[PDB]
A and B are shown apart, each in its own frame.
Chain A
Amino acid sequence: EVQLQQSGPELVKPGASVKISCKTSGYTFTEYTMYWVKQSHGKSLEWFGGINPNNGDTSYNQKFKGKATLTVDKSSTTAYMDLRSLTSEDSAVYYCARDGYPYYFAMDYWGQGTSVTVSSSDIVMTQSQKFMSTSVGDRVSVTCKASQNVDTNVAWYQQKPGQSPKGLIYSASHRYSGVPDRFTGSGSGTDFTLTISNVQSEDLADYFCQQYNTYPWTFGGGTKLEIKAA
């Protein structure tokens, strides 16, 4: 039912300006906070900013100060991110995501991402292993260390090849709807581990952790999973 459908891809000159869209449906638009995520090629996810559709309130990650503007149209149930003054650094995939609170903490639904390409004392999450390899049936764990206490407010995301991130674990150790028992969450305070129990073929993905303890939200560096079988 729930569905976040975004605009098409846009190629623009440097120093331009583009407004992309995230058209929602299947749920009451004003109930849930909308968010936006930047992701460059082969690089990690960066929490860009959020917006409350019930009153227009927003919050911007100061790293991207004044480079975008978040707005909503309650009549068309659509959220907008207006990117302004585009340099070469800005070319990346931009995801809109929904805050699932008060039910499923963090970002429980993700848009399909719009690929924008131009041409002419914060929290830090540490994921030591960039790459990591196992085989089908093996157990495996992925770790995160935060600079500060973040209690149990951490989510774990799965990004499969060329796909938008899908939520795996919310609130340190709770699975989203329809997540195999093989993914179990663990940790508290500073150290968090995600354990994939019976590694499957499907599990070839890139796993990020993400703290939602304080804005601006921050992600891990991605731990790439790789499977071999012969």
Chain B
Amino acid sequence: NLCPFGEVFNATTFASVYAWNRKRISNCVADYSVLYNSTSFSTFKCYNVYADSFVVRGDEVRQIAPGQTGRIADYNYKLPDDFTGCVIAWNSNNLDSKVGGNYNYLYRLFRKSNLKPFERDISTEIYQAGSTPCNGVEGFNCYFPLQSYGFHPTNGVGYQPYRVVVLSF
């Protein structure tokens, strides 16, 4: 009895990368040649299945790999170096972007430290960039930790919304 990957791959609305969804599926056969030929993906790297997924813009899809570095890998979704699973991603400009821009998709932009593998942070505390404290109030060197992806239909593929699914074991 094969796995119901359509449950997460074809979900109505995905989650922001910083608040990534962790849907887990157990005791089903996870075949790969079947998931490949289902739809032409843009990324299909491989290295009780946890199928966690989220939306990131295209030029940051490369950060969903073992031992990467950058906004996404550091502060949003960190994979360990010994990752044993698959990273599946594909374009979704028509679904996740609207004329004038879809802003529902967010990402963490600063953090006092890096994420451990598979850690998820969804705090809303004012990031202190300077020696002066913020005291909850936002200003110079006092930035809100979450920002919004643009996602206009005119953006280049680098700044275009991409659906990402990671099969972990």
Contact = CB atoms under 8 A, between A and B. Distances in A.
Interface residues of A, number: 18
B132 A215 contact: yes
Interface in B115-135: 128-133
A contacts with B: majority SS: loop
Contacts of B133: 153, 213
Contacts of A57: 140-141
Nearest to A58: B140
Interface in B96-154: 112, 128-133, 139-141
Nearest to A55: B143
B99 to A, nearest CB: 28
Contacts, number: 39
Given A102-B112, A215-B140, A50 B130 contact: yes
Interface in B22-67: none
Nearest to B140: A59
A24 interface: no
A212 B132 contact: yes
Interface string A21-54: 0000000000001000000000000000010100
Contacts of B141: 33, 50, 52, 57, 59
Interface of A: 33, 50, 52, 57-59, 99-102, 105-106, 153, 212-215, 217
Interface of B: 112, 128-133, 139-141
